[model samples]
Target: SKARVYADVNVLRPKEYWDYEALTVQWGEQDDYEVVRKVGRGKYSEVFEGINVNNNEKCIIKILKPVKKKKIKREIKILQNLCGGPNIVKLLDIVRDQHSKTPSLIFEYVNNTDFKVLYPTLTDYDIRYYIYELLKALDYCHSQGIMHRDVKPHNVMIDHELRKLRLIDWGLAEFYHPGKEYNVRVASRYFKGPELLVDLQDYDYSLDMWSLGCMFAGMIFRKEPFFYGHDNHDQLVKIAKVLGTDGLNVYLNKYRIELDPQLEALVGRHSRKPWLKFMNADNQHLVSPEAIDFLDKLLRYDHQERLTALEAMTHPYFQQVRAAENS
Candidate 1:
């Protein structure tokens, strides 16, 4: 399906803006940065806190694992295209080992706290503020004809002390071209949209909106992963259980997608759960009417039904956050 907004952005831009495969690497000096400490490890890359030897400045060094050259170029091109946009992570430089030619990405360091520890401490206003900040990045990326295929808490770096938020990790990002059937194996399992799980390959910017919805639900519900699934097949089952099987059926019908027999049985029948059903003593303070309304619009079964990132920022849930910024 065509994106409801900015459907022709890549069409309007020069070929250089969207032609990532033709990008030539402009490598920086490898010796300029040194790894200081291990920060994170992912299936695709190892992250380290690093020091710029020349300036003694802190940075994030993402040492990418061996993969297709096309993937590397795509990430760099997308980053370069979005470098200065609001709350988007800054990719400082690209470096590589001379002999092995192992590539590393240098990023401006964010003094971020672990989300497990940080999310628990966030006040309702803090949630509104940060999520608003995140939408700016999402809206900007989507407006630029790019989709962050992976938009989750882990990929969002928040320096709480500085009140700064950066949407990091462009590895799974892609420039949207209308009707292009992209790979569904993109976002993390917990954050995967129904489009991805149901194998609707022609999904667009709305995919990120669903991933953002998953993040929003987890935050307000106090469930680290609002949908707990054992595997890829189970992931859709988890989503179907909450969003309900009825809407799922409608979505499959609209897309002309038929789930495999095993997956169909696993999804079975499920009644749609009300949003308030998730609110409890611990999370009630964070779950307000506006928050619930906003979440409801976002967590819809139809990808086309999900709110665009820009529209989400205008929801009344962020009224105070927006008001504070305006004043």
Candidate 2:
């Protein structure tokens, strides 16, 4: 493991995980639940707000599409491994139909309001509190050796009434191994890390930090979908536009990352932009020295240069929130 980030290069194992083949999915009866309504959908699943008839409890039902059985097993295994971790969505049971063999994951339900509708209404404290809460989930998973490849606002469920946050959608997440290369096509376009955009497959947990930064900047700037990349090549161009082509070049040289020819054409000699430039009257409340500092650390062009989940929590941006928690 040539030095890449995460000082400890030792491969981390989950507290316990089953071999994908040995994962005997103890299938629960699908009939035990009824759909309340469709809440969300993903490439791999059709998610619905479902009710357990026997217990009359609300749970998110994710119906597995035509995905490999191994992929389904991996998701269940990872979910089980993270049980009881803070702000992690729980995996209640696995259910399947006899004829179609369609599998569904039943889990705890959150009465989440859309982030678009809810984030602008948050107080400064609310923004601080929830992001800190989100970091809890990110840290817990990273500690267990998981890299949540697809972290974005859509994957984060917030029950604003209870002031609760849960990091969901582990389908793209994988147990990271030191020196191992991974798929660059994991995260959504807007939130893809610089490593992914530049085709750096040997990325680590730091990838998630980049996505988190994008989310944070968007929240504070009140600009939804922070990096509005129209396509894959344009994603890095969009990022370079703000972080600057010069900084990205430094990162590429440092890591020896090769940019695609298409990307090369899209990016220019962009000078680094100031974080304060994003602050406007509408979102001045969320903009502060701490917020700027935090985003800057997380959104570095070099993947390894970004803060880890644990490190980000201790940043000055969360000092007041941390103090309040102690008090």
Candidate 3:
């Protein structure tokens, strides 16, 4: 018999068949922890700060809304595979309420804000050091065959002392298998790679490198992200404006995917550009030459030509800062 794969109701628009009542738990039935307050909310889960009554330690409890059985299983499998790294968020335990079938995960409580919210206040030296740490973490993840898929500042957490950054949110993460066609679109618009926009599934971990580039640029600018958009068309227009129509054509050819009709129509029609007026408009005087050079490489429209996380970390901008730090 073939194993049943459950599809998410919203994404697949399928009739709901899973029973939620079969998974409900009596309130306060579980022991060993006290719920403190709600800290965050996502599409299918809510995170709470809690204290372990038994160990006298703090932790975050994430209770997932009953999702399709397959997705729940897939998430558990990925997290298990990704366990045991300092740069990755540590998963402590997986708990299920016997009465309700509801699933919950316990993770180490990180006392830090998302880097997107913290970047503006960081000194120039601090920014360079943070990027170094981020690259080191990405290197470790790639070495382990994991592609974070999402690398925006909001997905990274900085400690209270601002000494370390940890990557979180593995819901969209996928294992990178060489030459395998996974055909999945799995990132937010601003941080998305060009291959994703054209719907190519065979792409590798280099997509993450592109995202890291965008994040580094966004942090340095303290303004809107380079690829800001309200929809797919808007995103493409924004990208083409900065990189130009010919630049986009080159990216499409390298990726070997035909652009959607709306985007294809914009090629060679430079007068219809949408992103020009906003480029380098705000705080232009405040941006250093080093920062500008780094941002340009990071924001390039072509994923194949974009700087890798490791390469960007060692670029002259970072090297100069590192040299100054040791002097």
Candidate 4:
């Protein structure tokens, strides 16, 4: 099914807007940026804290591993398209090794605290504030006809001192084409949406909303991963256990999907668990009726039923945040 909102975004844009492969590389000088220290490592890239020698400015360096040139172009094109959007990481420059020809991306540096340590210290208002900031980025990207296939706490760089949030990592981001069957093997297991687990390939921007739900749930409930699945198949089982088999069945039937026999048996029958049941003495401070209401709208079994980024921004959970901004 197509996105309920912004469904014709790519359709209406000029062909060059989404034609990533047609992009040409305008590489910058690699010697301008020097790696200071290792910060992150991923299957596709290695991240480093870097310094721009030209201006003595701090930056982030992400060196790409060998992959399809098409993939690299796609990320570059999407980043260029969304350059000045709210809370989106700025891609300052692109460089490649002189001899090796290994590509590296230079980004504006953000002094970030790891989410594991930072999340535990967030006040109730902090949660609403940061999440509201995040929604702005999501809505901007969706409006630009892009889907950030991977959205997790790790990808969200927060400079708490400045109260700033930047949605990072465009490597897995893609332009949305309505009815295009996407690779379900996109997001991290715990943050993957139900549509991905059920092999529903024509999913859209709503996928990021589900990932956002998982992040929000973890923050409120004090669980690192709201859904702790051992494997891809078990991921659905974990979600079904909470949201219940009934809704899962309805989603499958509506999409005309047939789960593998093993998966069906593994999922079995489960009753829906109420959101409040997750609250305990430790997490109660973070749990509120408005917070619960907003989350329930996000973690839906049906992709079509999930809230759009724009709609999510208007939810009552962020009322105080909105009022603060208006003031």
RMSD of 4: 0.8
The lDDT of model 1 is 0.93
Per-residue error at 92 for model 1, in Å?
Answer: 1.2
After the best TM-score superposition of candidate 1, give how far the Cα of residue 234 lies from its true spot, in angstroms.
0.8
Give the winner by lDDT: 4
State the lDDT of candidate 1 residue by residue for 144-191, as single tens digits: 999999999999998999999999999999999999999999989999
Ten contiguous residues minimizing lDDT sum, candidate 2: 1-10
Q: What is the C-alpha lDDT of each candidate?
A: 0.93, 0.85, 0.67, 0.94
lDDT of model 1 at position 290: 90
Predicted structure 2, TM vs. truth: 0.95
Can you write out model 4's per-residue Cα lDDT over 148-187, one digit (the tens) per residue?
A: 9899999999999999999999999999998899899998
Worst 10 residues of 4 by lDDT: 108-117
Q: TM-score per candidate, in order?
A: 0.98, 0.95, 0.80, 0.99
Task: Rank the candidate models, highest lDDT first.
Answer: 4, 1, 2, 3
The CA lDDT at 206 in model 1 is: 90
**How high is the lDDT of residue 2 in model 4?**
93
lDDT of 2: 0.85
What does the lDDT come to for candidate 3? 0.67
Tell me which of candidates 3 and 4 scores higher on lDDT: 4
